[model samples]
Target chain A: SYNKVVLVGRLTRDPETRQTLDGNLITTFTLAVNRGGDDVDFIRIVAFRKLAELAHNYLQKGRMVLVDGKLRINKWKTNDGQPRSTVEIWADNIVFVDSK
Target chain B: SYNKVVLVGRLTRDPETRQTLDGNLITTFTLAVNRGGDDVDFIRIVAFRKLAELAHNYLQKGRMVLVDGKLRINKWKTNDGQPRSTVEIWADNIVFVDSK
Candidate 1:
């Protein structure tokens, strides 16, 4: 059994870091993936620990990157009682696509 | 500019085929992917044309397979006026994992 997702895209926003309640670090960002032609899909990415630090340090808005990860879905309720859910790639590795 | 998802999992059900208005063939199914340990994620997969035909012909309930595809999201409104959305993998290729 396996689950893997690989994406090569430009960052829609700079990575943002936060600390979990247990003091673990995480970084969240979004990617603008071209769906061939003019279509594009925005996908959320989440990285933890070392991957988080790497992303937060090296990733910026509009930068190209390749991310390998597993798909995760989070479900919750909004303040107005509306049910909501989001899908994210929980990153295992990040490769820079931009020239140094 | 690229979005690829690869998953190795067991088929939750047999692949089903359908025809679009233009007579193009399509197949739909779901995979039960293990997330390490005891967790598993059920992901929807959609294939078209030759890929659809192959999947419908070769895949069965409880069979293991590997799929490569792009991530897709479909959003719609329910009859009850509630917004609903589903995520799927638009499969480009499927490899049989079980030995013949």
Candidate 2:
């Protein structure tokens, strides 16, 4: 029973919007978080429903945002029987950190 | 200026303790975090000094912990000039989440 993730970072680009087959909204973005002095880490983040709508409507490139979510890893098989992997954070709560 | 990370998860194993050249204490652990229903992600976490000492003394395998930190990526090189990379969370604060 594991659940928890919180991050604050600048959006690398404006969120990309998409719709599920069922008409549910979704958005994906990337965050570049600085670590200490010189290092930075890029994290893939996704949001759904209202969160997704807000992300698409209010967030922009280089804006600071705080996200709370759970980490997810996607696994699939390649045509050659190899495996492909990708990690993402499925955001449940998001807030603009730079707003007045 | 980016800074912030928080995670709650069960320790995959007991924290590993080490000492720096200056005799500072350090501890590292892996966390198994669940995403949604069936997915899980493993995160590497590191703590230093007093936090590290507390981790070594009080944490056990499978213990639930809440950690606040910053994401860090470590870089190095092999003798043959190949680059090595590792991503970790440098924990600044940690707390046991299971105790009453």
Candidate 3:
């Protein structure tokens, strides 16, 4: 099947960019979303390659952005043998929602 | 800022539908998405009200559909007081990718 995810929210913090062993750029950031409620959900978003460069150069803390991506669930066990899982968005396309 | 998530995938199973105390419709389903890799991510998707009704009526096992929504992370504690969390897509809109 197909997979995609799109979201619009403000950057909760500065994006962290790094390079892979193969020289590909990867940037990771968090989006804080208030859905007209008292609670704000902090969603993690990741970008790679050209998309990673765009987010690295143009995005910053507190700026609103729209992210298009797919969900990846990571599951692992603790050293104590407790199983756990986490989900993240792997961004394919990213855009500024507000005029910069 | 605003928040949204869009996903396209095949229904891994039939959607389960139920009604709230006030007669509101809620449908829950899972999407199996392959990101061109051997690994497939199974994501949880939920719809409410009219959208819920639509998903219940049109979606089935193996149907390709698109979902747009926000990510909600549920956090709670186990009986032993261990904190835990999970993520879900709360669908605001859904569409069939293939002509039904």
Candidate 4:
């Protein structure tokens, strides 16, 4: 068993929505998380269901957010047969952070 | 912009409690998460304030927890002048995964 992640950051842009093959809604966004000093990390985030809906509806560029999800690494072969890899956070819950 | 993470996993053991120099309560635990295809990873987690209180009060060894937090890497020097590094999840919110 190996699954865990947590992050707090601001949205880089509005979320992008898509549909799964099974017709489930999925939304993806990017977060810019500050690391204390001059270090900031960019994270790819995805969400589904009500969380996805909320993210799509209210989270905009520059809004702060807290996401809870699993870390997933996607690996695939390009058309040229070269290897490609990407790391993403598969969100299970989304929390609005800018609210008072 | 970057900051995000999520994970569903079982606690490896009971949490360890400590008092910070400012007298704030802190708790630390390890999580064992399951990945697909026989892969697993252990993650270190830390909590503070009310979140730390909740973790110490309700969480037990082997209990499953869902944490929303930020990732932080701690680096320091050992007594022998060697470098040591540890990664941790600094919890912002914690949810009981076994809840109905």
Candidate 5:
């Protein structure tokens, strides 16, 4: 019904798990994606609830994975009264891209 | 062997075509993507050669398309010495995302 993005990339590091104020599990990691030559985009990925738990338990650093999700642009204000924004993915489904 | 991306979105406008120095054709267009609510990401897509020709001839404004490609981060320097870069999708396959 809306925009969806699927990406295959290698995890830059192991996931970090944390809990929300309501005690919900959340997992975060960065995907290191190279598009050929030199530059690489370190895209941050966030997973929650069951998805978060699966990623934390099964995924590891440098593992190649395919993430299907939508983008979230978070807008907020800083302590200095300046506005800031960031782009992160809200993963709906993640599959291992490697065939080995 | 590399990173890949798949996106489904609506084209914002008709594609524009141009020729390279070697006379190969290129087509460029923008995809208006809404992840879920409010914000949208206007992503730029580039198709080359036969793909370019196909897009120019068949794709239209507001049509939903599924693009499978790799991200290309182009780096260059402006005339004033400031550096500039862009992230664009180099499409290998473009298909109709609509079921109608």
Candidate 6:
């Protein structure tokens, strides 16, 4: 069994990076995808280690990129006691879709 | 902006089909994906029109398939008002991974 996801979209904002307790770098970003019309879906993406570094260094707001990843779902609750969940892509590869 | 998802996995159950109010066929199935070890993720997939008929006709439980699609997220509230959500792949194409 295998899982793969590929997306081409514009970054909603600059990528953010942080150091894990194990000393590895992790980066997170959001991609705004408009498949046909004005309706846009904001997707969360996470990258680790070297991929994280590249994303943080090279990606910026409104930059178009292609992300290859896998889907993951996490469930939790809001501080206000309401049920909530998140859908994210754990990215393995990232490509710059826009020419520099 | 573009969105795509590709999955190779075994069907957890047989595909189910239904007719839309607009007289279109729609099918849904779940895939059990094992990326490593014993960890498995069950992903839901939906196919429409010709793809829907094909899936319902050809897919069976335990059959391996490669699905090409896009991700969709929907949110709602339960009867008791608890929040709920679903992550699904709306499939455009499906390929048999096993030789007939």
lDDT of each: 0.90, 0.81, 0.85, 0.78, 0.80, 0.88
Clashing residue pairs in candidate 1 (N, C-alpha, C atoms within 3 angstroms): none
Q: Where does the lowest 10-residue lDDT sum fall in candidate 3 chain B?
A: B1-10
Expressed as tens digits, the lDDT of each residue in B8-72 for candidate 4 is 78999999988899989999998877787766566778999888888889989999888877766
Error of 1 at A29 (Å): 0.6
Docking class of 1: medium
lDDT for model 6 comes to 0.88
Error of 4 at A26 (Å): 27
The local distance difference test score of model 1 is 0.90
Comparing chain B with the reference, what is the TM-score for each candidate?
Answer: 0.91, 0.90, 0.92, 0.88, 0.91, 0.92
Of 4 and 6, the candidate ahead on DockQ is: 6
Candidate 6 lDDT tens digits, A22-52: 9999999999888687776788999999999
**lDDT value, residue A38 of candidate 6:** 71
Interface C-alpha root-mean-square deviation, candidates in order? 1.4, 3.3, 1.7, 5.5, 3.6, 1.6
Q: Kindly list the per-residue Cα lDDT of model 6 for residues B1-100, writing each as its tens digit.
A: 7899989999999999999899999999999878688767788899999999999889999999999989876667889997667888999899986797
Q: Top DockQ: which candidate number?
A: 1
- Flag regions of model 2 displaced more than 4 Å: A20-24, A73-86, A97-100, B20-24, B73-87, B97-100
Q: Give the per-residue lDDT of model 2 (tens digit) for A12-53.
A: 999999998999998999988775576777788999999999
DockQ of each: 0.62, 0.38, 0.55, 0.23, 0.27, 0.56
Chain A fold similarity by TM-score, each prediction: 0.91, 0.93, 0.90, 0.90, 0.91, 0.90
Q: For residues A1-100, could you state the per-residue lDDT of candidate 5 as single tens digits?
A: 3555677888999999898999899999988877567668777789999999999998899999988776655566879986545556789999986764
Q: Judge the docking of candidate 3 as incorrect, acceptable, medium or high.
A: medium
Superposition error at A75 for model 4 (Å):
21
Tens-digit lDDT track of model 1 for A1-100 = 8788999999999999999899999999999998888877788899999999999899999999999999886767989998778788999899987796
- Candidate 1 stretches with Cα past 4 Å from truth are A75-84, B76-84
What are the runs in model 4 whose C-alpha is more than 4 Å off?
A1-33, A36-100, B79-81
State the lDDT at B78 in candidate 5.
75
Q: Tell me the deviation in Å of residue B42 in model 2.
A: 2.4
